[PDB]
Amino acid sequence: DIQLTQSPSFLSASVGDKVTITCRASQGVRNELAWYQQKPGKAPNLLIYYASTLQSGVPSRFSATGSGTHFTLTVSSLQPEDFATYFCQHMSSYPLTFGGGTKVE
Amino acid sequence: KKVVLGKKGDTVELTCTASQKKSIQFHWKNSNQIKILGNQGSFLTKGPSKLNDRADSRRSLWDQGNFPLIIKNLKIEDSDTYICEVEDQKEEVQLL
Amino acid sequence: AVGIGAVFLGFLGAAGSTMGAASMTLTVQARNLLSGTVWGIKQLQARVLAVERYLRDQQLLGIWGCSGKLICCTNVPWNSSWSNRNLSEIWDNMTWLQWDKEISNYTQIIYGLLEESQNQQEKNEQDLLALD
Amino acid sequence: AVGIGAVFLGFLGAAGSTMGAASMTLTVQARNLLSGLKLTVWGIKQLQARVLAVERYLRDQQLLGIWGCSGKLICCTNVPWNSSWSNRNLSEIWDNMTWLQWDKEISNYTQIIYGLLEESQNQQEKNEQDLLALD
Amino acid sequence: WSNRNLSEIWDNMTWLQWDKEISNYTQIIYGLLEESQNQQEKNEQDLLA
Amino acid sequence: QEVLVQSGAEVKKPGASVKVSCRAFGYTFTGNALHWVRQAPGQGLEWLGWINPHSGDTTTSQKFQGRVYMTRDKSINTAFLDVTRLTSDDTGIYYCARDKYYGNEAVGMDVWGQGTSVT
Amino acid sequence: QEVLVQSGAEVKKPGASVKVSCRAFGYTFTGNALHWVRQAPGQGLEWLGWINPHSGDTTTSQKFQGRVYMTRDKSINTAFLDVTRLTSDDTGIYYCARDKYYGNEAVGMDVWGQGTSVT
Amino acid sequence: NLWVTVYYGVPVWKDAETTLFCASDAKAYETEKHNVWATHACVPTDPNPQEIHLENVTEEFNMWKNNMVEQMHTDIISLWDQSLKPCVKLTPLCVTRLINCNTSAITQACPKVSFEPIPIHYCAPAGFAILKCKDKKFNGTGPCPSVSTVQCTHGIKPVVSTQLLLNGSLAEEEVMIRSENITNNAKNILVQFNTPVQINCTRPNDIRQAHCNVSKATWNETLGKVVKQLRKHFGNNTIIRFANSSGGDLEVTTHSFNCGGEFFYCNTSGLFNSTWISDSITLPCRIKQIINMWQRIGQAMYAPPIQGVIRCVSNITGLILTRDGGSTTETFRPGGGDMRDNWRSELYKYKVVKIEPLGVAPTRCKR
Ligand SMILES: *[C@@H]1O[C@H](CO)[C@@H](O[C@@H]2O[C@H](CO)[C@@H](O[C@@H]3O[C@H](CO[C@H]4O[C@H](CO)[C@@H](O)[C@H](O)[C@@H]4O)[C@@H](O)[C@H](O[C@H]4O[C@H](CO)[C@@H](O)[C@H](O)[C@@H]4O)[C@@H]3O)[C@H](O)[C@H]2NC(C)=O)[C@H](O)[C@H]1NC(C)=O
Ligand SMILES: *[C@@H]1O[C@H](CO)[C@@H](O[C@@H]2O[C@H](CO)[C@@H](O)[C@H](O)[C@H]2NC(C)=O)[C@H](O)[C@H]1NC(C)=O
Ligand SMILES: *[C@@H]1O[C@H](CO)[C@@H](O)[C@H](O)[C@H]1NC(C)=O
């Protein structure tokens, strides 16, 4: 398979901070990535499709860059509704898999 | 600009005429934004004015294209400019 | 990317979609144009009028003679005075509704030029070529 | 001489012309076979007119469907012209013959033409294209 | 859809038995030949022209 | 308006098969690819399979081939997930997700169901 | 049975414009082109131009471009002639005429109207 | 360099105003006078309804200039004037500033039958479509964000009411007010609820007397959410008052409706009473024998009703009001009497469109 790793595993920050999450792929995947947010007990909500395009309804404070095997999810200001788990997935070849999971607190 | 004079204690007919011959929607209002009376299709409704129990309209004559206003026992205080609303047309008339 | 095949949006399914993606769903909206005492002949009137509505358009697509329908090409030159926008702007970035809105007043001259330019110039030249 | 363009003789207009325009204005007469209590009998008359007109167009179109042309209003078929049907030069036919008198001459022989073109050539063009698609 | 060859089907069988043997798979044939080949042949001649 | 509705909780004894349902409201069911995502308690999301609701074509990951089946019903706009021969591994939360599906390929999972708890 | 009927005689001031009508009975109006010819009293004919009644195109001689205008009306089968910027030269009888029109060209002026006197 | 191609079957619709048909279910055995009307009216329904959601597309809805309101009006006048046979009708003839009008009298047989209304649909012929606006908080006039095409309408019960709305369809999220023009003082405002108000309204075992009980607390929180929803259009600081009526005929100054074939007239003086700033209510229904006809101008006299008990419960789902603008506080007085305003609250979100499936487009072909 293609194994996807996330860094850091656990992040601690305050309100209003700009932080970055790094998604690393074991193989070339081009611009084919999706970023999701999952709250405890809820269903995941879509944030970024095609690794740079913002989903309608998501606030514009999010950004996502990257290609090849390197990807960054960047937030500029933090809010109490924003602290949840963040996932990155690939769809380039079978099978699909998700990331390890990053906790922000 | 039509101007009509009524004597005290008599009956006055007062007129607004529509362009076509159909049972349509009309309204009758005074100058200070208080409704006198209008229709609701096949019925009649009256406004919150002091002339509520005093104004009458002929239901038979509505089909011709004319919508009257009958005022009996005319007073001094009702001398005003009355407006008839017939499909966004401002037909105003002064009553003394 | 991974695919599983084409899909089915239904009737009027790609009206909000792009110009190029609505050029392969014409077959779904082809069929619906036909479909199929007092207050007992209004239904017959509606069905007969729908049949005439389909058959007039069938005659109009048979007189600009292709009959291999849902697309056919002609050699009428598209005048640059109509739709001066680029090909990539009108073929990949804009819906069909605004295209019909912008060529709403200039359709009849296009119809009258297709009917007369391409029915006595393409025809009666095959007869001259068939002399040998 | 000097000219300005074509004219519009209208519906059935070249019924006295000697081929020519009558063999050119095929599109003006084929476009109106479709036309583009008291109501329980009159409406049945009007609907019986309209549906019969739709039959009148459709059953004439099905014969052109059998004779595989699909480039309608003018199409060529490869049946040879027998001299027993009409013994005339084409300069006599296409310069000095109106359509009505030509149909009056031909109309005794028309059903044989229809049966021969239905039976022979459409059964000799189909079941031969399958033979052409062998390899 | 049918395991019979090209020889028995055109000389040893009626149309009614073939309509019985094909009625389990008429819609897949109609859908395939309606969608796929008129979605591939059309706009291919546009690329050719 | 676009929403996917799943069934209730289910507890089943190991060795048998489990069927779970997912119904679509607010969007046209026959045009959008549909994914199945399961989540173990305390772990991340693991992908199961994905189905075209029109042609009936399915594709399951090779770790779950021959044991997980995906079916659909067009007249009710529903999808059925069968997972057979359960061990204690497969206890968790099941999710059906609508794919965005732009350009006849997978794009992203925009609307998810409320999830079912299977034990 | 085929005739052309024209309007009555008119008198006009110099520098004005005059409009004269010509209605066709007894032949199909949209089938034959129409000529306009004038005749001042004392000598022969003079020619203005001719018009297609169907396509709407006109043709005018080079002595009268921008001064002589030709229109038509299909609903009442009429042709209208407008002569502007009048002098004393244009006083005479005006004629509309039906062209024979064999072989998509001009052949002869067969049926003529009774004439309209303009002074 | 570029040539044209014709396209057949394109997703292009224009606006049209053609006729349609009811296509509603008919039982064809019972004599309630809606069902035997429905058998000679139209075909029964298709059991599997078609609903196709569209992609991103905007369309301009206008429920004050719709065409299906007139179709509703013509069809339901044709139902009422063929089902309710009156004892005697007096109508103005008015043969042609002096106009002489003779009250023509029509006399016929007048039996008594049940008049429980039934749900009907409205299904367009081939080559047309019905667009439905799906915004949960719809203003009434303007663009719609995500339309959806439907085969035909949800079940509409053709009820006749004044001053109230009966057996209607609730709103999606909250109570909504709809108007052609705020600050015009001549247009009725329509109020659509989000919860039904159950009212029982029955004739107990004089024969022209009926008691009509509605709940108090549910109607109180209903009027509270109505006033909270209408305070956004008037500065959120104005006093709001409810008054009973102002003059008019008997069918407009009172809650005028039908129940069991009886023409119920109920006073609403104790129902619009409170003034707002920043157990059971009973209504005295009197069964009248005279009515003013709503299909035209004229009066109608009927028979005395059937002896026995007549019971009917209903769900209040909306209101027809109007403003009493002054020179400050705001007074809202309930109105009505035009059935076009009564049936616009069930057809507030529907549009009829005509497919024009033949277009032209430039590309790079040849013959
Ligand atoms: C209304 O809703 C519809 C959906 O129903 C939206 O339509 C989609 O819009 C998205 C853009 O947001 C389209 O996504 C794009 O798809 C491309 C597919 O590639 C094919 O098509 C291109 C067209 O030129 C060909 O060149 C190519 O060879 C393929 O054949 C992707 O390739 C695009 O991604 C690339 O381009 C962007 C451009 O910046 C880059 O940033 C990316 O990194 C990447 O390199 C792009 O994602 C989608 O295709 C549309 N759907 C359909 C069916 O066409 C409408 O946008 C929406 N709104 C409106 C107003 O209509
Ligand atoms: C597109 O077509 C129009 C006419 O359909 C062309 O317009 C011409 O404009 C000139 C300007 O004076 C006229 O003299 C011609 O008579 C017009 N043509 C016709 C046929 O009437 C226009 O030129 C065309 N566009 C291009 C780029 O050639
Ligand atoms: C032509 O017609 C005559 C009519 O009798 C017939 O005898 C002859 O065989 C025909 N010839 C051909 C070639 O059709």
Residues 6+ apart with CB under 8 A from G77: G23, G24, G25, G29
Q: Which numbered ligand comes closest to the C-alpha of C20? A: 1
What residue of C is the nearest CA neighbor of F53?
C7
Gap between the Cα atoms of H65 and E28, Å rounded: 46
DSSP H344: T
What does the DSSP assignment read for H292-314?
E-SSSS-EEE-----SS-B--EE
Interchain contact, C2 vs A93, CB within 8 Å:
yes
Is C4 contained in some domain?
Answer: no
Cβ-Cβ contacts under 8 Å, C1 against chain A? 32, 91-92
**Are H4 and H360 contacting, i.e. CB atoms less than 8 angstroms apart?**
yes
Interchain contact, D5 vs G105, CB within 8 Å:
no
Cβ-Cβ contacts under 8 Å, H364 against chain E? 46, 49
Gap between the Cα atoms of H57 and H253, Å rounded: 44
Chain H: closest CA distance from residue B76 (Å): 22
- Interface probe, candidates H46, H53, H55, chain F, greatest F C-beta count within 10 A: H53
**Are G34 and G97 contacting, i.e. CB atoms less than 8 angstroms apart?**
yes
Residues 6+ apart with CB under 8 A from F114: A43, F5, F6
Over its C-alpha atoms, chain B yields an Rg (Å, rounded) of 13
Touch between chain H and chain F (3+ CB pairs, < 8 Å)? yes
Please tell me the total count of domains within chain C.
1
Report which of H131, H338, F90, B27 is spatially closest to residue C97, judged by C-alpha positions.
Answer: H131
Q: Distance from the CA of C93 to the center of ligand 2, in angstroms?
A: 29
* Atom 22 of ligand 1, residue of closest alpha carbon: C92
Letter for the amino acid at A1? Answer: D
Q: Which atom of ligand 2 is nearest to the CA of C80?
A: 27
Place of tokens 């609250």: H345
What does the DSSP assignment read for H190-228?
EEEEEEEEEEEEEB----S-EEEEEESHHHHHHHHHHHH
**Are C47 and H126 contacting, i.e. CB atoms less than 8 angstroms apart?**
yes
Q: Which is it for the CA torsion E30, E33, E38, E39, positive or negative?
A: positive
Gap between the Cα atoms of D73 and C119, Å rounded: 10
User: What DSSP element (H or E) covers D114?
Assistant: helix D110-116
Report which of H17, D53, H124, H44 is spatially closest to residue C48, judged by C-alpha positions.
Answer: D53
Is C5 contained in some domain?
Answer: no
Gap between the Cα atoms of A48 and A64, Å rounded: 7
Q: Which numbered ligand comes closest to the C-alpha of G55? A: 2
Helix C42-63 crosses helix D39-66 at what angle (to 10 degrees)?
30
Task: At H263, list the tokens.
Answer: 């023409």
Residue H9 vs residues C34, C107, C111, D71, H292: alpha-carbon distances, Å: 11, 16, 17, 21, 51
Gap between the Cα atoms of F92 and F18, Å rounded: 13
Letter for the amino acid at F86? Answer: L
Residues 6+ apart with CB under 8 A from C113: C76
Range of the domain at G116: 1-119
Gap between the Cα atoms of G90 and H34, Å rounded: 80
**Are C91 and C37 contacting, i.e. CB atoms less than 8 angstroms apart?**
no
Place of tokens 């656990």: A10
Report which of F75, F26, F84, F68 is spatially closest to residue F53, judged by C-alpha positions.
Answer: F75
Gap between the Cα atoms of A91 and A35, Å rounded: 12
What's the CATH number where G67 sits?
A: 2.60.40.10
| Cβ of F103 below 6 Å from ligand 1 | yes
Which of G30, G52, G104 faces D10 most closely, judged by CB atoms?
A: G30
Give the three-state DSSP class for H76: helix
Letter for the amino acid at G119? Answer: T
G52 exposure class (CB count in 10 Å sphere: 0-12, 13-18, 19+)? buried
DSSP F31: G
Chain D adjacent subunits, 3+ CB pairs under 8 A: C, G
Give the three-state DSSP class for B44: strand
Report which of H248, H266, H249 is spatially closest to residue H257, judged by C-alpha positions.
Answer: H266
Please tell me the total count of domains within chain G.
1
Q: Which is it for the CA torsion C89, C95, C96, C100, positive or negative?
A: negative
Report which of H141, H136, H173, H167 is spatially closest to residue H154, judged by C-alpha positions.
Answer: H167
| Cβ of C80 below 6 Å from ligand 2 | yes
What residue of E is the nearest CA neighbor of H3?
E49
Q: Distance from the CA of F106 to the center of ligand 1, in angstroms?
A: 13
Q: Which of residues 8-67 of D touch G (CB under 8 A)?
A: 8-10, 13
Report which of G98, G99, G90, G95 is spatially closest to residue G114, judged by C-alpha positions.
Answer: G95
Range of the domain at D43: 12-132
Determination technique for this PDB entry? Answer: cryo-EM
Letter for the amino acid at G24? Answer: A
* Atom 13 of ligand 3, residue of closest alpha carbon: D82
**Are F53 and F71 contacting, i.e. CB atoms less than 8 angstroms apart?**
no
Count other C-beta atoms under 10 Å from residue H186's C-beta.
Answer: 17
Give the three-state DSSP class for D55: helix
What residue of D is the nearest CA neighbor of C116?
D27
Q: Distance from the CA of H150 to the center of ligand 1, in angstroms?
A: 28
Which of C41, C52, C119 faces D27 most closely, judged by CB atoms?
A: C119
CATH 2.60.40.10 fits A1-105, yes or no: yes
Report which of H55, E30, H48, H8 is spatially closest to residue C32, judged by C-alpha positions.
Answer: H8
Interchain contact, C66 vs H362, CB within 8 Å:
no
Cβ-Cβ contacts under 8 Å, F32 against chain C? 7
Say if strands A102-104 and A10-11 run parallel, antiparallel, or are unpaired: parallel
Residue C121 vs residues A84, G7, G104, H201: alpha-carbon distances, Å: 71, 43, 17, 79
How many C-alpha atoms does C132 have within 13 Å on its Cβ side?
1
| Cβ of D82 below 6 Å from ligand 3 | yes
**Are H355 and C32 contacting, i.e. CB atoms less than 8 angstroms apart?**
yes
| Cβ of C79 below 6 Å from ligand 2 | yes
Touch between chain C and chain A (3+ CB pairs, < 8 Å)? yes
Gap between the Cα atoms of F82 and E13, Å rounded: 42
Count other C-beta atoms under 10 Å from residue H158's C-beta.
Answer: 19
How many C-alpha atoms does H22 have within 13 Å on its Cβ side?
29
Is D5 contained in some domain?
Answer: no
Q: Distance from the CA of D110 to the center of ligand 3, in angstroms?
A: 14
Residue F50 vs residues C7, C30, F56, F59, F109: alpha-carbon distances, Å: 14, 31, 11, 6, 11
By residue count, chain A amounts to 105
- 3-state SS, chain C, equals CCCCCCCCCCCCCCCCCCCCCCCCCHHHHHHHHCCCCCCCCHHHHHHHHHHHHHHHHHHHHHHCCCCCCCCEEEEEECCCCCCCCCHHHHHHCCCHHHHHHHCCCCHHHHHHHHHHHCCCCCCCCHHHHCCC
Which of H48, H53, H136 faces F28 most closely, judged by CB atoms?
A: H53
Gap between the Cα atoms of F115 and F81, Å rounded: 13
Residue B89 vs residues B13, B27, B28, G29, H171: alpha-carbon distances, Å: 20, 11, 12, 47, 35
| Cβ of D62 below 6 Å from ligand 3 | no
Give the three-state DSSP class for G97: strand
Count other C-beta atoms under 10 Å from residue A57's C-beta.
Answer: 8
Report which of A3, A5, A11 is spatially closest to residue A24, judged by C-alpha positions.
Answer: A5
Which of E35, E42, E46 faces C70 most closely, judged by CB atoms?
A: E42
D70 Cα distance to chain centroid: 13
User: What DSSP element (H or E) covers H72?
Assistant: helix H68-83
Whole-angstrom distance between the N-terminal and C-terminal Cα of chain H? 14
Where would I find the beta strands (DSSP E) of B1-96? Answer: 2-4, 11-17, 27-29, 35-39, 44-46, 55-56, 66-72, 80-85, 90-95
Whole-angstrom distance between the N-terminal and C-terminal Cα of chain F? 31
